[PDB]
Amino acid sequence: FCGSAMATGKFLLAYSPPGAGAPDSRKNAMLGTHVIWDVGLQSSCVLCVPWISQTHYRYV
Amino acid sequence: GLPTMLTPGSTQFLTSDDFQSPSAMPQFDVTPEMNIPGQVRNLMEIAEVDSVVPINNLQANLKTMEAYRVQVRSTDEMGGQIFGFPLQPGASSVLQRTLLGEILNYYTHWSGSLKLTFVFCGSAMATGKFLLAYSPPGAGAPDSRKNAMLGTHVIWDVGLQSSCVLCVPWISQTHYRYVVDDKYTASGFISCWYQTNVIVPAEAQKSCYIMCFVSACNDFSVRMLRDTQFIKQDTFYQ
Amino acid sequence: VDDKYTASGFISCWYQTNVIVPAEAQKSCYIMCFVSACNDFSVRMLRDTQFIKQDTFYQ
Amino acid sequence: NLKTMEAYRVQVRSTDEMGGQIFGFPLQPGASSVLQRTLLGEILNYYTHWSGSLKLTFV
Amino acid sequence: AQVSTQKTGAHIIHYTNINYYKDAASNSANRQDFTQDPSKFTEPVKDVMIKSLPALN
Amino acid sequence: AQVSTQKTGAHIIHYTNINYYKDAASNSANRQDFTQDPSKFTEPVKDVMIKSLPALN
Amino acid sequence: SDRVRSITLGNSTITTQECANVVVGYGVWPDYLSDEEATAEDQPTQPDVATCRFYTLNSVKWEMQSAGWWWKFPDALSEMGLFGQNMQYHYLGRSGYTIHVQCNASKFHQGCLLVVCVPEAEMGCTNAENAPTYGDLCGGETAKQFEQNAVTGETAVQTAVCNAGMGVGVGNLTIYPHQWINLRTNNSATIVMPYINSVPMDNMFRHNNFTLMIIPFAPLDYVTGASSYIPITVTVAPMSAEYNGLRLAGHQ
Amino acid sequence: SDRVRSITLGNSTITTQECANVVVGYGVWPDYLSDEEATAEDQPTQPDVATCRFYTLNSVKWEMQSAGWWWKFPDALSEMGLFGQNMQYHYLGRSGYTIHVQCNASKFHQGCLLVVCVPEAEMGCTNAENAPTYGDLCGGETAKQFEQNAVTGETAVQTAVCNAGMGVGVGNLTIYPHQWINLRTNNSATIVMPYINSVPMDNMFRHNNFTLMIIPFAPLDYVTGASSYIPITVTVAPMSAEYNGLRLAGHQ
Amino acid sequence: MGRVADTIARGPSNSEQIPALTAVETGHTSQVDPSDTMQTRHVHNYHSRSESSIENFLCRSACVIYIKYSSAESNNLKRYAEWVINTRQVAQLRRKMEMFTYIRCDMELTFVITSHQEMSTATNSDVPVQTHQIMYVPPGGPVPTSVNDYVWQTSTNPSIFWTEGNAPPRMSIPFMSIGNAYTMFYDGWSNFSRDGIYGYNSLNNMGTIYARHVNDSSPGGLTSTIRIYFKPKHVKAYVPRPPRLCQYKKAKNVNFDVEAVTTERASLVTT
Numbered sequence A: 001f002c003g004s005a006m007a008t009g010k011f012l013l014a015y016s017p018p019g020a021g022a023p024d025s026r027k028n029a030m031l032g033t034h035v036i037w038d039v040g041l042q043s044s045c046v047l048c049v050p051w052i053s054q055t056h057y058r059y060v
Numbered sequence B: 001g002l003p004t005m006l007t008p009g010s011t012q013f014l015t016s017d018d019f020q021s022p023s024a025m026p027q028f029d030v031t032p033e034m035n036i037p038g039q040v041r042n043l044m045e046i047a048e049v050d051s052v053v054p055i056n057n058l059q060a061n062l063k064t065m066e067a068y069r070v071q072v073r074s075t076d077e078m079g080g081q082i083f084g085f086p087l088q089p090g091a092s093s094v095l096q097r098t099l100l101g102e103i104l105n106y107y108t109h110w111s112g113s114l115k116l117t118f119v120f121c122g123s124a125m126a127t128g129k130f131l132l133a134y135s136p137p138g139a140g141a142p143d144s145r146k147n148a149m150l151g152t153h154v155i156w157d158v159g160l161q162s163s164c165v166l167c168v169p170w171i172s173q174t175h176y177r178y179v180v181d182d183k184y185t186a187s188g189f190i191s192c193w194y195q196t197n198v199i200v201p202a203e204a205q206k207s208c209y210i211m212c213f214v215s216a217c218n219d220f221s222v223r224m225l226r227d228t229q230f231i232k233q234d235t236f237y238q
Numbered sequence C: 001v002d003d004k005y006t007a008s009g010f011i012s013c014w015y016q017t018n019v020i021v022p023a024e025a026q027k028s029c030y031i032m033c034f035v036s037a038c039n040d041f042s043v044r045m046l047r048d049t050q051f052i053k054q055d056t057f058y059q
Numbered sequence D: 001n002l003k004t005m006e007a008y009r010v011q012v013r014s015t016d017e018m019g020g021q022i023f024g025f026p027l028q029p030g031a032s033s034v035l036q037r038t039l040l041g042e043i044l045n046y047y048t049h050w051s052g053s054l055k056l057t058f059v
Numbered sequence E, F: 001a002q003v004s005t006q007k008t009g010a011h012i013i014h015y016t017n018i019n020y021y022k023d024a025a026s027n028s029a030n031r032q033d034f035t036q037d038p039s040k041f042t043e044p045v046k047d048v049m050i051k052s053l054p055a056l057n
Numbered sequence G, H: 001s002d003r004v005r006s007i008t009l010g011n012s013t014i015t016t017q018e019c020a021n022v023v024v025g026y027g028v029w030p031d032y033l034s035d036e037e038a039t040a041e042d043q044p045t046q047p048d049v050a051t052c053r054f055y056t057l058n059s060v061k062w063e064m065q066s067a068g069w070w071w072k073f074p075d076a077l078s079e080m081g082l083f084g085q086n087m088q089y090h091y092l093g094r095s096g097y098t099i100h101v102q103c104n105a106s107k108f109h110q111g112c113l114l115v116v117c118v119p120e121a122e123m124g125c126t127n128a129e130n131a132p133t134y135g136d137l138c139g140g141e142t143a144k145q146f147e148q149n150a151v152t153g154e155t156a157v158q159t160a161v162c163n164a165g166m167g168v169g170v171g172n173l174t175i176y177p178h179q180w181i182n183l184r185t186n187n188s189a190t191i192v193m194p195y196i197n198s199v200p201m202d203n204m205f206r207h208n209n210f211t212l213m214i215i216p217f218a219p220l221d222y223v224t225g226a227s228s229y230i231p232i233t234v235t236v237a238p239m240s241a242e243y244n245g246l247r248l249a250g251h252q
Numbered sequence I: 001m002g003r004v005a006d007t008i009a010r011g012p013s014n015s016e017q018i019p020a021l022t023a024v025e026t027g028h029t030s031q032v033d034p035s036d037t038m039q040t041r042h043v044h045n046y047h048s049r050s051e052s053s054i055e056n057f058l059c060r061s062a063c064v065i066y067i068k069y070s071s072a073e074s075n076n077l078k079r080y081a082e083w084v085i086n087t088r089q090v091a092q093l094r095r096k097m098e099m100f101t102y103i104r105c106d107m108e109l110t111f112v113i114t115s116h117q118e119m120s121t122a123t124n125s126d127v128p129v130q131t132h133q134i135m136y137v138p139p140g141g142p143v144p145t146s147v148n149d150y151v152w153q154t155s156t157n158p159s160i161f162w163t164e165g166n167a168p169p170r171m172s173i174p175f176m177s178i179g180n181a182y183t184m185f186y187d188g189w190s191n192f193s194r195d196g197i198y199g200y201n202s203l204n205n206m207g208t209i210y211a212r213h214v215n216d217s218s219p220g221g222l223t224s225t226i227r228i229y230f231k232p233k234h235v236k237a238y239v240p241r242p243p244r245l246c247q248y249k250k251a252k253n254v255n256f257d258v259e260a261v262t263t264e265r266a267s268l269v270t271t
């Protein structure tokens, strides 16, 4: 977050594994993997998106 | 004398008390005991014995032997539901005048699993398969065979062994249920469907019968004695 | 119960300084108060409460 | 303020003077209008006696 | 027979009770159990808050 | 049970009491305590006054 | 610092950088039912991570004249993921929860909320001859709202914060597991509710174990020229969810 | 943190959440007079908690053109509680003090104060033939005020911060026990003065052991639309107060 | 014992310890004593919380109903009376139990049975001492429809027979909920549909008391009134609730009328 230090927010960072399309609501986005980011002194938050794949590799 | 003080209930006659009282035949010599076969010590020795269940208790069948048998046949389709009744072994029309159900109507509470045995009374050349189902409540009775097999079920295969038990497990929020029908204490539904069909030779009958039995399991108990509603009088018998 | 022999004192709150606040923040604020017993607190002699009453049985 | 949420909050502000008294009430946690319908005060009105210290938290 | 201390002051003092019934619902009420645990209402917090320290560091 | 002497003469003589209650206010009154100390009313003086001597020397 | 926390449940995680501890309601942390307290004799399904994981509910707008909001549980999660699916197919369920409320603001805004989970929050009715209907007790993922003053109706819930919708002092909802969100201190509340009932398991549509109420005790206030939309978001994860009495879907 | 402190004396307690330590003047903490330094042969009364306890004085308004304030001791506590009563009835007294100054502001306000306790702060006079009178040295619980520029009079104190009312550099009042209150840092000063005199005890009306002076070195300043009333409150507790030479009340 | 904490002696302080300051945004409430905010002496304190136990609070007999019946049937009271068992028709006893969500307890039921002479055109009364029956009928038992019917044979139904001029009769009742505690508040419905009865009355099903004169009617008329008293015993209570603020309306609902939090004051500052 590159706002002011008087600005604060909360965001839902989501990853959805495939086979049901992209989430079209915040409701459907939180059924997937997610990190709720809280903006504070720590200016950054990591959404680690896990491998979760049928195959051991994927094509580039 | 010794200082004493009387406390509430000093002269009451409570009918569920046990107190000592002087005998009116002091020093009476009772007859010796002998062993009489079949000593009962508990009413759960009567409730755990099978009893034929009237699952076909329609208006015409009440005073006849039709009550205790449900026809099953060789259908030209799959065949639908054969019977179904709300489980409640003390308040259901089906189950409440059996041995289990009349020992239940002297009590207000019950708990534990019960077992419905079924017997095919066709020919030995007749064979079938049936889906015996129990559905826990909160979604109504199953209206398809699909919905009946989402519940607890035993698929019965008719063979040399003529009977199959659907044991219906306790599965209850409360530790006890009321003998009376109460919507909080709702106990589920029982049903029977054709899984295959009754298939039989030409020279053997297309229709057969099925009976049902009911008894308590070994985890079953009852609590809180009360008068039964099944016996009554308007004046003293003479 | 209030009894003049058993009089228990007075509570008050005063400004010691002032509420000082920027231009872009509100000049008025609120204060709440909470109350609870300490670990040396006890009560004696059960009685009916005067805060609940009825004129006929509820049905 | 009785049937509203104003009951539980006392305004405090940026004054142009020192500012006077904000509130005050006679202590008596079972007979005071202020304190007798709180948890402490309604457990007190089932009893005729009380003793010990109590603690008023402010926020 | 059960012999137990009476409620007595401050700065003989026992009584005798015999139960006369086969049920424990018939027994006189237990009035002398004074166990407490106020901490599950008064301090129901995951991290132990030490009084002398800041609540929120 | 408490076994204690009865009031008896001059020139069997015990009774038995069992308390039946959980309070000591429920107990029968203590009538057999005969302790005395009249000296705090009868002789309440800082200096001990000996009977045979002058009161005021 | 004590202000930073993460809670990870399933494939969800929440972060806070202002929080006022975590309240564990009655000092009891969620767990599965034991064999000595059981009474349902069939094997329980325990879906673990698939049902235990944060579910964000619909947000509510905090206004200066707002009087509060409530959501009943388990009926706010009845359409949420596989938690709501396992409610459909099972007669019994049994779950604890961690309830996490989010409401950030600037340092030029002020207000105070009570966040409280009330076990068995049976509610009154506007008409004294009638019971409140389901549509007025529950909104699902959407909150039902308290009103500042008394309301009228026939099957409407009597809403009026002073009575808390239950006929009791609203200031006395502090013996129930609770935290406050005061905008000058913290931006989040966390309560961890154990399973609390007098039966070991119960049906999840016919009964509401507790109700989360969020009630402004100090109104929202800010100087005009600052943000005028401030949401309150409630994100709640089941914990130790298990179900018995498998049958066909429905609840009628 | 080092910013939070409490001081408990008697039945009073003060809390701070911004403070810049505590100055113990000359590294000596208040104590009762010893038997080897005594000279008054009667038993001393030591009222303990009844006299040793914070007494809040009248507050002064900090303005942008304020030049400072002073209170002389023990004559600012001469009507305060039983401390002031034991001054009435006793020829001698002897006490140390903890002096605590409070002056909070927002983070959009600026200013700096010197808070200094000056032993034996004998003051000059406008007319060079005359002594300043008691009414101009002392206001009791009310402060006397310094002026920005030179004043005139006959028995008036010469007030002009530059001379500090004593004919010395005002910037050199830093070898005396002192703290600063800078509004962007701390909102409180604390000085603990021992008893300092060249006699072991002395009369409490005829002599002033020290004077607390509060002098703006950076004027109060803020943008119009912010709080314009900012008080300075001085709350001061006696410590180890004891008195000798009991007789009838008065001082003449 | 139930003895309370002693006060601990404390001197002057000046430290970075801050017992007074706290955040109430935590659910935690402060643990401060007087020994944290001022001097204090040591007080050895012998006061007890003995009578503030829940087994002393709830363990006093409270009237829950009275019901009347008449030999003559003078004023529409029939020759027997009935009462569906509940604890919610009386304000005082109800409020005490509703400070808890779940209670398991045994009860002790005491009956105070009185009779009075009625106006009649009868002349010459010398009516024998009345005997009365109090019959408890568990759920789903047969019920009286008259004073003479077969149900008063009490073959399995618990029953008391008591004659006037004697000590009030009492019987213990054990804990007997289907659940593992009685439920004072139920936020559910009796149907999975979410219809039907809502509230605690869904789970109420505690049988019915019936009471009659056992004696045949005499030429005048007597009305007897029986007052029923319940005393909790052996109590464990769970989940504290606020005491009621509002007066009750109904014995099967919590419906309430909106009422004031507290009583008036003239201003913020009162003496």
Ligand SMILES: CCCOc1ccc2cc(S(=O)(=O)Nc3ccc(C(=O)O)cc3)ccc2c1
Binding pocket: C054, C055, C056, C057, C058, I063, I065, I066, I090, I227
């Ligand atoms: C004659 C026609 C009927 O008149 C009345 C008049 C006033 C009534 C008041 C009440 S109450 O206060 O809600 N409950 C009581 C409970 C127990 C007792 C007792 O006596 O133990 C007393 C009152 C109930 C019924 C009442 C019938």
Ligand SMILES: CCCOc1ccc2cc(S(=O)(=O)Nc3ccc(C(=O)O)cc3)ccc2c1
Binding pocket: B233, B234, B235, B236, B237, I148, I149, I150, I151, I152, I153
């Ligand atoms: C006045 C002329 C006579 O009227 C009647 C009317 C109704 C009767 C009903 C019955 S019964 O129900 O078969 N048995 C009972 C047994 C015991 C009790 C009791 O009271 O304990 C009650 C009834 C017997 C005789 C009856 C005479």
